[PDB]
Design a protein around this ligand. Sequence first.
Ligand SMILES: CC(=O)NC[C@H]1O[C@H](O[C@H]2O[C@H](CO)[C@@H](O)[C@H](O)[C@H]2O)[C@H](O)[C@@H](O)[C@@H]1O
Length: 434
Amino acid sequence: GLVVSFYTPATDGATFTAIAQRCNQQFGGRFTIAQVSLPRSPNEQRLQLARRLTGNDRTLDVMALDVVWTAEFAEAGWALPLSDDPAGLAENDAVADTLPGPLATAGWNHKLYAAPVTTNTQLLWYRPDLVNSPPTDWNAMIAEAARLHAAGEPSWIAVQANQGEGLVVWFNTLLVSAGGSVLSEDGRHVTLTDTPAHRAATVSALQILKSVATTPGADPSITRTEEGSARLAFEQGKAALEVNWPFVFASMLENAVKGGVPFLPLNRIPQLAGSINDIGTFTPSDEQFRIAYDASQQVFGFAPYPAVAPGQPAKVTIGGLNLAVAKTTRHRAEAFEAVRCLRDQHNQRYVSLEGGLPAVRASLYSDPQFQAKYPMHAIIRQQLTDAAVRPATPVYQALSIRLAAVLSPITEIDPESTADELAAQAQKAIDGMG
Ligand SMILES: CC(=O)NC[C@H]1O[C@H](O[C@H]2O[C@H](CO)[C@@H](O)[C@H](O)[C@H]2O)[C@H](O)[C@@H](O)[C@@H]1O
């Protein structure tokens, strides 16, 4: 039969490949889903997809889009509205049993242009052996890092924030948690410094970035043009504190069974031998998962994202992937059917438990079988319930590029002047000038 192309980020290739294979057994010769990988950064995923769309690549069918691209891909007509499904089933499937935050990321001008498949929110990860209590706010984070430095322990605070979208996500979380916002609701005005309260929020966020940057024992990966991994920095024992997406859970066990984690020698447990499947994925039995998790809990713990204002949780920036159908497709019906199968219950369980990507199906967070294998479900769902959002605007690419260029390196942030520079660059971005 025909082939529905399914473009996903390369680091999520295998996972989605597996999901496609499952769905391929359910169509039975009618058509086949073929996964194709896109580069690692959201900007490059966007660039590849945009080149194929403006180039009228008629072989491009289904796209796994970062939540930040919806607006653009809706305004350009690149992502077909879900109401363009010839079967008329896409919208109802997308809203059914799906968390409202992801759905909000999938909409534009009161219409859905994608069906959420994965969502994302950052947690705090710590070494319970070296850190007696997980810090609840960012000043506590700085104090704990300084204490670990004074104790000769790893004092890095591992944040996946080099000079790109990760840094913008960190800033957005800090800013919204402080009561601020990059843009107005309609995305037409810059709200970083337009009122005293807004400017105060921006200044507090920049101050937190600067103080984390210059904390005793700070990571030297920020003062360089690096592609460093906070996940691997934690897994190598260089950091006892990390804020990152939940996939680092699935990584930690997996890499520990492969022998790649020094302080967690899961590879030396005979009962875990063979728990790595033939394509390199940690697929434990129930008892093997119990063994691995109970061993990991003495050196690996999770906690809510640190608050900005002590006394209430943070507003954590939402991320994830929404499934959209490209306007270039020759088979709208099969593309939307594939979208529906790719996000069904079984594949959501798989994408969360094996792929490390938070599911969007609300039912799963109320499923005890799922909860027993995904111990972070409660914190994830609560952080998704009151999540921060990045601005939804068709010029988000230029906006994020300009904001990242100003923010980095965070060692050079001067809160007041940097706030003014951020507002000016954001204005340039939204003026059709970025
Ligand atoms: C480094 C960073 O944080 N960039 C911002 C994007 O982070 C998330 O996406 C990345 O991480 C996911 C794993 O958790 C992975 O599936 C994606 O392929 C990565 O691009 C987040 O989901 C995105 O919305 C952020 O834009």
